Write a protein that binds this ligand. Structure first.
Ligand code: NA
Length: 322
């Protein structure tokens, strides 16, 4: 049953599984003080008596893996790479590492020192680890752990992050994209409520592949949940498309401007129906960002798009592939 099985000691070592399973276990120097037999196997979900429970839009995105010896404690983190088979990109849904100590309860896996610290974690090892970006394209998740639980598995779910804003007001920023901000004035909401400001970056390489040089784009910014009215106008700040930061084609105000503000109001997980709302609200430019207001939660999307009549068509082609 073992996809990987090898001896390692204080000097560390690694092993890949067959190209059909894509597992990789990397045990850095100094993590394993005594000689130990590192193994990994797949676990059929039928054999679990209590499989991970799943809400409506949650699913397992990888094989369940049992790393051996179970309960192995390491002196500093080790690395496991596992392919995933999620049917989506990084918009409304996220991938998370789950673990089960004995197969009965499933909880999110914690790592105190993650991707930022990879160079330290390798402890001078002569191996390469790909970047997040390369891992994303190859559809591989990297697990950083100081121990082997009975099971690990990757889960797809709706993004769980949120902040609470009340009638006193406040601001939200995004986890991933730093300049994306929303400002809620004093009576925007009547009571204390969960909100997210969800910024999805748009990679140049994908825009270039699908659209060439016909347009660039800002990140997509969604105020969640959608289908809510605000009682005061909420202030949004979105970073400009890269080609506008560099040199704007025009003043970017009123109606014929090639800087288009797109909006989608519909509900649904990774659903959008884009409308060009350029010059129905006023945009103010500063610190490489556009600033405008909305009375409704929605998706917003800026595009520097000279052929202005094609902006919605381009956004649609692009969004389907994000
Ligand atoms: Na995501």
């Amino acid at each position: 049953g073992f996809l990987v099985s090898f001896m390692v000691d204080a000097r560390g070592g690694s092993m890949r599984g067959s190209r059909h399973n894509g597992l990789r276990v990397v045990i850095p120097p100094r993590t394993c003080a005594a000689p130990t037999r590192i193994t990994c196997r797949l676990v059929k979900p039928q054999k679990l008596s209590t499989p991970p429970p799943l809400a409506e839009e949650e699913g397992l995105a990888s094989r369940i893996i049992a790393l051996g010896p179970t309960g192995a404690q390491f002196l500093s983190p080790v690395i496991v790479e596992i392919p995933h088979f999620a049917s989506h990109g990084r918009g409304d849904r996220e991938l998370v590492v789950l673990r089960s100590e004995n197969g009965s309860v499933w909880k999110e896996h914690r790592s105190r020192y993650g991707e930022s610290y990879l160079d330290q974690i390798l402890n001078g090892m002569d191996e390469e680890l790909g970047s997040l970006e390369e891992l994303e394209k190859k559809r591989v998740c990297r697990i950083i752990t100081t121990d082997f639980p009975l099971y690990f598995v990757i889960m797809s779910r709706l993004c769980q992050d949120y902040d609470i804003i009340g009638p006193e007001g406040g601001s939200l920023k995004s986890k991933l994209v730093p300049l994306v901000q929303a400002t809620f004035p004093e009576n925007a909401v009547t009571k204390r409520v969960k909100l997210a400001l969800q910024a999805q970056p748009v990679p140049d390489e994908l825009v270039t592949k699908l659209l060439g040089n016909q347009a660039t784009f800002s990140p997509i910014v969604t105020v969640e949940p959608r289908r809510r009215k605000f009682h005061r106008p909420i202030g949004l700040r979105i970073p400009l498309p890269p080609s506008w930061t560099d040199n704007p084609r025009d003043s970017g105000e009123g109606d014929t401007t090639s800087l288009r503000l797109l909006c989608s109001v519909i509900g649904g997980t990774d659903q959008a129906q884009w409308e060009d709302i350029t010059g129905t609200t006023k945009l103010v430019y500063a610190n490489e960002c556009a600033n405008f207001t909305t009375n409704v939660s929605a998706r917003f999307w800026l595009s520097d798009c000279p052929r202005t009549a094609e902006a919605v068509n381009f956004a649609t082609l692009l969004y389907k592939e994000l």
